[PDB]
Symmetry: D2
């Protein structure tokens, strides 16, 4: 087939990793799930967390940078989707670094399993 495509079902779930700042080992990395191309956030269906791993070149092992839980999905004493409060599955991880390396991010849908994305961090 000449026409290439992509499953929307997958795209709305991948943790998209975007480096924002990396001047002089001062790094700010944003991860979101469905940035402008959105995944539902209901009491029954939501992204629960995102986790970010970084492995600097010449490091035998990878390091977890941090983890971000998105705790609120509209539940209240009046029923599901009534609180008004919904946490958005975007996180910014700010960290120091002395070398370039690989970034890997993980996310979780409460009904659609575990997901992963990768990206490169080169020190500009």
């Amino acid at each position: 087939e000449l026409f290439q495509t992509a499953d929307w079902k997958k795209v709305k779930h991948v943790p998209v990793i975007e480096v924002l700042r990396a001047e002089g080992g001062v790094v700010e990395v944003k991860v979101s799930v469905g940035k402008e191309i959105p995944h539902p956030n209901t009491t029954e269906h939501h992204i629960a967390w995102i986790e970010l791993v970084f492995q600097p070149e010449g490091s035998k092992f990878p390091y977890v940078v941090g983890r971000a839980e998105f705790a609120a999905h509209g539940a209240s004493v009046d029923g599901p989707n009534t609180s008004g409060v919904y946490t958005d599955p975007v996180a910014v991880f700010a960290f120091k670094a002395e070398k370039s390396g690989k970034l890997t991010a993980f996310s979780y849908c409460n009904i659609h399993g575990l997901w992963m994305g990768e990206a490169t961090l080169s020190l500009e």
Copy 2:
């Protein structure tokens, strides 16, 4: 006594809340520890996490918005402070809201205990 003062040690640790955006429900809140006075980030001594709580006016109960773990503090197989990777204790909680309310932030130093901060969310 008579001569009031301010503990520098206390401000080094307080989670500071900074609303960045509240227009039209779309809220973004920055929390950070050590903003004005730098808090150590060494394998020995560092800020472990920040949790954001929000209670909209009208609601009898508060909701956790989310939690952010800051996991790297320079430990490698080479020893303490040798990995050159340190997660900065600062998070951005993005979330949808439909009423104004109260923001409480908590935070933890691995040697200096638990910490609390407060702020008002004016959904103007």
Copy 3:
């Protein structure tokens, strides 16, 4: 009033802390929310986590021992309460210790706010 009572609404939410073993600084502490006196675990209503703090005598500061998220509340692609999988809001924290002290536990209902319980750990 001669007759004393207690709100059931509160009891089903308090983190009950029970020391199981403490021989020689080898400590095992169990925390549950509504042990035989149960709190609902539905996709809309559930206990999200329990956290355990310990402060040993003669320690200026308290230490978080650990935290236990209960991630599964029956949600699946077929709707709420269909997965068959529900995590029980009980956790065991095993840890070492050299002195007696105070235990404090925290729990979270997703629609009924934050809760706390206290207990003493003496080293037998």
Copy 4:
């Protein structure tokens, strides 16, 4: 080569899964790291957490059962390894199930990377 061997370093780190009870849906799973060969728990080097994933047969997706953070590693204001408080890397996930399935556990050393373990849940 020709002479197969087993890495002692690898077993020190593997999360080991142990079903304790599965009768009638009521499951309890112990996960631990360093069961047979002790893994260091020092401020410098220690196991940060364990996460349990479960995928019942029939279900297209896995569910996180829960996560357990092990937060204390002896750090005090007096320095490294001086608090005399260390969280043992071992958790008990209790949960209700209605079908047999697959158990995957993950775990993290602050200097020796991420780790994975597997086991079958026979809801006999």
